[PDB]
Design a protein around this ligand. Structure first.
Ligand SMILES: CC(=O)O[C@@H]1[C@@H](O)[C@@H](O)O[C@H](COS(N)(=O)=O)[C@H]1OC(C)=O
Ligand SMILES: [Zn+2]
Length: 257
């Protein structure tokens, strides 16, 4: 099926998923001098105090830390968002080298990786229904640069050995996503899509201005994961990012000057 290699990668997706060439695809390049400051944007509210993590899973495309979303335990509100969006999982995209890995770019600059915290609009009742709506999801995107270690990331790094290959999962309770946030919540926002098949155009993207720093040793451990399942030839899980798509008829708004 689909992947990130020469023969099944982003260039090929449109054949099974024609929406790949659609009206509001992600990610995009964020041209910082074209984005418009919008004073009508309310403050962004990230309420992760009661967050309940459950499990970490290698699905062959990335790894996901999954959350109990049966109640309003961890929610995103405010900013460009109307209503309440519940945290369902977070995952990362990263590169084979420190100079690439992010999905969004900032004035064409690629970061070593990108963290995505996926939330769904509670008005639609469940995640499956939400992805069929133009305002069904809100994904908070955070850039990673290589520098000093991120303490809040280490617990994730430590468990990757136990989910090396496709299909593996491990218990991952009591993880606090607040430890992955930068100091500032300044952001850009635009309407877009999922960055993997089925590429549904259901996402309000909120991308933070301030990157978090992770150590080279930390990102190196991401690159030791496998796309393949156990007992198959090793294909390192690296460069699992879609490149920037055309902005087309969209405007990127900024929460800051
Ligand atoms: C659970 C799962 O497969 O999560 C996916 C995940 O593991 C990854 O490949 O990234 C995908 C796209 O999400 S993104 N980049 O925020 O648009 C995910 O799809 C979905 C639907 O969340
Ligand atoms: Zn993602």
């Amino acid at each position: 099926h689909w992947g990130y290699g020469k023969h099944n990668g982003p260039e090929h997706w449109h054949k099974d998923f024609p929406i790949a060439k659609g009206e509001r695809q992600s990610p995009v390049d964020i041209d910082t001098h074209t984005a418009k400051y919008d004073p009508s944007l309310k403050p962004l509210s990230v309420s992760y105090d009661q967050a309940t993590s459950l499990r970490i899973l290698n699905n062959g495309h990335a790894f996901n830390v999954e959350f109990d979303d049966s109640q309003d335990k961890a929610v995103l509100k405010g900013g460009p968002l109307d209503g309440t969006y519940r945290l369902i999982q977070f995952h990362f995209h990263w590169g084979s080298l420190d100079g690439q890995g992010s999905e969004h770019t900032v004035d064409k600059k690629k970061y070593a990786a990108e963290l995505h915290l996926v939330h769904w609009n509670t008005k639609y009742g469940d995640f499956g229904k939400a992805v069929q709506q133009p305002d069904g999801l809100a994904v908070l995107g955070i850039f990673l640069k290589v520098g000093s270690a991120k303490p809040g990331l280490q617990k994730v790094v430590d468990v990757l050995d136990s989910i090396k290959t496709k299909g593996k999962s491990a218990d991952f309770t009591n993880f606090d996503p607040r430890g992955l946030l930068p100091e500032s919540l300044d952001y850009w926002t635009y309407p877009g899509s999922l960055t993997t098949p089925p590429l549904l155009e259901c996402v309000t993207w909120i991308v933070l201005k301030e990157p978090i720093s992770v150590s080279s040793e930390q990102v190196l451990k991401f690159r030791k994961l496998n796309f393949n399942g156990e007992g198959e030839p090793e294909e390192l899980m690296v460069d699992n990012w879609r490149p920037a798509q055309p902005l087309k008829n969209r405007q990127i708004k900024a929460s800051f000057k």
